[PDB]
Amino acid sequence: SPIETVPVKLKPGMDGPKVKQWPLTEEKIKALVEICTEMEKEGKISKIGPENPYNTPVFAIKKKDSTKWRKLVDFRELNKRTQDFWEVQLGIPHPAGLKKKKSVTVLDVGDAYFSVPLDEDFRKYTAFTIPSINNETPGIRYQYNVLPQGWKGSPAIFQSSMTKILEPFAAQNPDIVIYQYMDDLYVGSDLEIGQHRTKIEELRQHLLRWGLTTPDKKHQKEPPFLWMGYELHPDKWTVQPIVLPEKDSWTVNDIQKLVGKLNWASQIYPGIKVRQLSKLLRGTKALTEVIPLTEEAELELAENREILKEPVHGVYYDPSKDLIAEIQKQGQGQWTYQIYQEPFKNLKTGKYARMRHTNDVKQLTEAVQKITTESIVIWGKTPKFKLPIQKETWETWWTEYWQATWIPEWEFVNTPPLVKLWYQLEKEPIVGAETFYVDGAANRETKLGKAGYVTNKGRQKVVPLTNTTNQKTELQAIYLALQDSGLEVNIVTDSQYALGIIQAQPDKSESELVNQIIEQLIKKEKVYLAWVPAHKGIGGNEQVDKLV
Amino acid sequence: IETVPVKLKPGMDGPKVKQWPLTEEKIKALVEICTEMEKEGKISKIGPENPYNTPVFAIKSTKWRKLVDFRELNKRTQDFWEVQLGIPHPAGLKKKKSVTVLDVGDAYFSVPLDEDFRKYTAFTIPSINNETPGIRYQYNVLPQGWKGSPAIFQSSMTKILEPFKKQNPDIVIYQYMDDLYVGSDLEIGQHRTKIEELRQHLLRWGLTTPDKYELHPDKWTVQPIVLPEKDSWTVNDIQKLVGKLNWASQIYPGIKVRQLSKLLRGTKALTEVIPLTEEAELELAENREILKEPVHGVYYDPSKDLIAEIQKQGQGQWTYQIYQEPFKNLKTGKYARMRGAHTNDVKQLTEAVQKITTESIVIWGKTPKFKLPIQKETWETWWTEYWQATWIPEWEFVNTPPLVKLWYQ
Which 3-state string (H, E, C) describes B236-281? HHHHHHHHHHHHHCCCCCCCCCHHHHHCCCCCCCCCCECCCCHHHH
CA separation, residue B251 to residues A275, A535, B66, B237, B244 (Å): 47, 21, 43, 22, 12
Residues 463-492 of A with CB under 8 A from B: 490, 492
Is cis: bond before A417, omega within 30 of 0?
yes
A526, β-bridge pairs? A488
What phi and psi values does residue A454 have, to the nearest 5 degrees? Answer: -150, 115
Residues 105-124 of A with CB under 8 A from B: none
Q: Is B345 labelled a binding residue?
A: no
Q: Of B74, B77, B70, nearest to B11 (Cα)?
A: B77
Nearest residue on chain B to A95, alpha-carbon basis: B129
Angle at B386 between CA A399 and CA B21, to 5 degrees: 105
User: CA B189 to CA A371: how far, in whole Å?
Assistant: 50
DSSP H/E element including A515: helix A512-523
Q: How far is A70 from chain B (nearest CA, A)?
A: 29
Q: How far is B274 from chain A (nearest CA, A)?
A: 12
DSSP H/E element including B31: helix B24-38
- The reply to whether residue B21 touches residue A405, judged by beta carbons under 8 angstroms, is no
DSSP H/E element including A386: strand A384-387
Q: Cβ–Cβ contacts within 10 Å for residue A341, how many?
A: 18
Q: Of A153, A102, A100, A101, nearest to A126 (Cα)?
A: A153
A410, β-bridge pairs? A385
Torsion of CA A163, A164, A169, A171, to 10 degrees: 100
Helices (H), A80-212: 154-171, 193-209
In chain A, residues with a C-beta closer than 8 Å to the C-beta of B130 are: 89-93
Q: Of A504, A539, A17, nearest to B261 (Cα)?
A: A539
- The reply to whether residue A372 touches residue B381, judged by beta carbons under 8 angstroms, is yes
End-to-end CA distance of chain A: 85
- The reply to whether residue B51 touches residue A378, judged by beta carbons under 8 angstroms, is no
Q: Counting every residue, how long is chain B?
A: 409
Angle at A297 between CA A291 and CA A301, to 5 degrees: 110
DSSP 3-state helix, strand, coil percentages of chain B (rounded to 5)? 35, 20, 45
Rounded to the nearest angstrom, the gap between the alpha carbon of residue B221 and the centroid of all alpha carbons in its chain is: 17
Experimental method: X-ray
In chain A, residues with a C-beta closer than 8 Å to the C-beta of B267 are: 435, 437, 454-456, 539-540, 543-544
Nearest residue on chain A to B405, alpha-carbon basis: A402
In chain B, residues with a C-beta closer than 8 Å to the C-beta of A405 are: 345, 374-375, 378
Identify the burial level of B109 via C-beta atoms within 10 angstroms of its C-beta, where 0-12 means exposed, 13-18 middle and 19 or more buried: middle
CA separation, residue A149 to residues A115, B1, B249 (Å): 11, 46, 69
Identity at A426, one-letter amino acid code: E
What phi and psi values does residue A22 have, to the nearest 5 degrees? Answer: -60, 120
Q: Does B399 touch chain A (CB under 8 A)?
A: no
What phi and psi values does residue A531 have, to the nearest 5 degrees? Answer: -120, 140
Angle at B300 between CA B299 and CA B301, to 5 degrees: 115
CA separation, residue A450 to residues A455, A492, B391 (Å): 17, 17, 56
* Cβ atoms B107, B42 nearer than 8 A: no
Q: Give the best residue of A368, A406, A546 to mutate against chain B (max B CB count within 10 A).
A: A406
Residues 230-259 of B with CB under 8 A from A: 234-236, 239, 242-243, 246, 257-258
DSSP 3-state helix, strand, coil percentages of chain A (rounded to 5)? 30, 25, 45
User: CA B316 to CA B335: how far, in whole Å?
Assistant: 8
Q: Cβ–Cβ contacts within 10 Å for residue A89, how many?
A: 17
Is cis: bond before A224, omega within 30 of 0?
yes
Rounded to the nearest angstrom, the gap between the alpha carbon of residue B12 and the centroid of all alpha carbons in its chain is: 26
Q: Of B108, B207, B119, B91, nearest to B148 (Cα)?
A: B108
If phi > 0 it is left, if psi is from -120 to 50 it is alpha, else beta; for residue B200 that is alpha
Angle at A411 between CA A410 and CA A415, to 5 degrees: 125
User: CA A238 to CA B109: how far, in whole Å?
Assistant: 50
In chain A, residues with a C-beta closer than 8 Å to the C-beta of B47 are: 6, 86, 160
User: CA A238 to CA A347: how far, in whole Å?
Assistant: 10
Helices (H) and strands (E) in chain A, counts: 13, 23
User: CA A494 to CA A504: how far, in whole Å?
Assistant: 17
- The reply to whether residue B128 touches residue A97, judged by beta carbons under 8 angstroms, is yes
User: CA B70 to CA B394: how far, in whole Å?
Assistant: 11
Q: Is the dihedral of CA A407, A412, A416, A420 positive or negative?
A: positive
Q: Is B178 labelled a binding residue?
A: yes
Q: Is B103 labelled a binding residue?
A: yes
Q: Of A149, A128, A148, nearest to A139 (Cα)?
A: A128
DSSP strand E in A8-94: where? Answer: 58-62, 69-73
* Cβ atoms A541, A492 nearer than 8 A: yes
Residues 109-128 of B with CB under 8 A from A: 128
Nearest residue on chain A to B399, alpha-carbon basis: A403
Residue A184 makes CB contacts below 8 A (sequence gap 6+) with A106, A107, A108, A109
Q: Strands A488-493 and A434-436: what pairing? A: parallel
If phi > 0 it is left, if psi is from -120 to 50 it is alpha, else beta; for residue A182 that is left
Q: Cβ–Cβ contacts within 10 Å for residue A307, how many?
A: 16
Which of A83, A153, A373 minimises the CB distance to B381?
A: A373
Q: Does A301 touch chain B (CB under 8 A)?
A: no
DSSP strand E in A388-498: where? Answer: 410-412, 434-436, 439-442, 448-454, 460-466, 488-493
Q: Of A245, A238, A270, nearest to A260 (Cα)?
A: A245
Which of A6, A89, A454 minimises the CB distance to B130?
A: A89
In chain B, residues with a C-beta closer than 8 Å to the C-beta of A179 are: 131-132
- The reply to whether residue B378 touches residue A537, judged by beta carbons under 8 angstroms, is no
Angle at A158 between CA A157 and CA A161, to 5 degrees: 85
CA separation, residue A440 to residues A72, A267, A435, A457, A527 (Å): 70, 48, 17, 20, 20
What phi and psi values does residue A40 have, to the nearest 5 degrees? Answer: -60, -40
Return the biggest CA–CA distance within chain A: 107
Q: Does A341 touch chain B (CB under 8 A)?
A: no
In chain B, residues with a C-beta closer than 8 Å to the C-beta of A407 are: 344
Nearest residue on chain A to B52, alpha-carbon basis: A86
Three-state DSSP state, A123: helix
Q: Of B3, B103, B407, B30, nearest to B228 (Cα)?
A: B407
Q: Does B23 touch chain A (CB under 8 A)?
A: yes
Q: Give the best residue of B25, B27, B230, B270 to mutate against chain A (max A CB count within 10 A).
A: B270
Identify the burial level of B343 via C-beta atoms within 10 angstroms of its C-beta, where 0-12 means exposed, 13-18 middle and 19 or more buried: middle
**Angle between helix A360-379 and A391-400 (nearest 10):** 100
Q: Cβ–Cβ contacts within 10 Å for residue B166, how many?
A: 8
CA separation, residue B228 to residues A85, A393, B236 (Å): 62, 31, 12
* Cβ atoms B375, B398 nearer than 8 A: no
Q: Of B2, B180, B12, B19, nearest to B81 (Cα)?
A: B12
User: CA A233 to CA A226: how far, in whole Å?
Assistant: 9
Q: Does A540 touch chain B (CB under 8 A)?
A: yes
Side-chain-side CA neighbours of residue B8 (13 Å): 17
DSSP H/E element including B139: strand B135-139
Q: Of B105, B393, B406, nearest to B240 (Cα)?
A: B406
Q: Does A139 touch chain B (CB under 8 A)?
A: no
Residue A398 makes CB contacts below 8 A (sequence gap 6+) with A405, A407, B345
**Angle between helix A512-523 and A470-483 (nearest 10):** 20
- The reply to whether residue B312 touches residue A428, judged by beta carbons under 8 angstroms, is no
Residue A118 makes CB contacts below 8 A (sequence gap 6+) with A5, A8, A126, A144, A145, A146, A147, A148
Which of A87, A406, A531 minimises the CB distance to B382?
A: A406
In chain A, residues with a C-beta closer than 8 Å to the C-beta of B234 are: 429
Q: What does DSSP assign to residue A287? A: T
Q: Does A180 touch chain B (CB under 8 A)?
A: yes
Which of B131, B262, B349 minimises the CB distance to A404?
A: B349
What phi and psi values does residue A12 have, to the nearest 5 degrees? Answer: -55, 135
User: CA B391 to CA B134: how far, in whole Å?
Assistant: 25
* Cβ atoms B346, B374 nearer than 8 A: yes
Q: Strands A69-73 and A103-108: what pairing? A: unpaired
Q: Of B348, B370, B345, B347, nearest to B357 (Cα)?
A: B370
- The reply to whether residue A86 touches residue B271, judged by beta carbons under 8 angstroms, is no
- The reply to whether residue B344 touches residue A407, judged by beta carbons under 8 angstroms, is yes
Q: Does A179 touch chain B (CB under 8 A)?
A: yes
* Cβ atoms B52, B139 nearer than 8 A: no
* Cβ atoms A505, A499 nearer than 8 A: no
Q: Does B267 touch chain A (CB under 8 A)?
A: yes
* Cβ atoms B83, B15 nearer than 8 A: no
Three-state DSSP state, A402: coil
What phi and psi values does residue B24 have, to the nearest 5 degrees? Answer: -60, -40
Q: Of A298, A367, A365, A301, nearest to A335 (Cα)?
A: A367
DSSP H/E element including B43: strand B43-45
* Cβ atoms B83, B148 nearer than 8 A: no
Q: Of B69, B58, B54, nearest to B23 (Cα)?
A: B58
Residues A162-189 as b or e (16 or more Cβ within 10 Å = b): beebbeebeeebeebbbbbbebebbbbb
Torsion of CA A47, A52, A57, A61, to 10 degrees: -10
Which of B47, B261, B402 minimises the CB distance to A160?
A: B47
Q: How far is A153 from chain B (nearest CA, A)?
A: 8
- The reply to whether residue A91 touches residue B381, judged by beta carbons under 8 angstroms, is no
Identify the burial level of A136 via C-beta atoms within 10 angstroms of its C-beta, where 0-12 means exposed, 13-18 middle and 19 or more buried: exposed
* Cβ atoms A310, A245 nearer than 8 A: no
User: CA B41 to CA B43: how far, in whole Å?
Assistant: 6
**Angle between helix A496-503 and A470-483 (nearest 10):** 60
Identity at A65, one-letter amino acid code: D
User: CA A110 to CA A272: how far, in whole Å?
Assistant: 39
Side-chain-side CA neighbours of residue A396 (13 Å): 14
Residues 419-448 of A with CB under 8 A from B: 428-435, 437
Identify the burial level of B227 via C-beta atoms within 10 angstroms of its C-beta, where 0-12 means exposed, 13-18 middle and 19 or more buried: middle
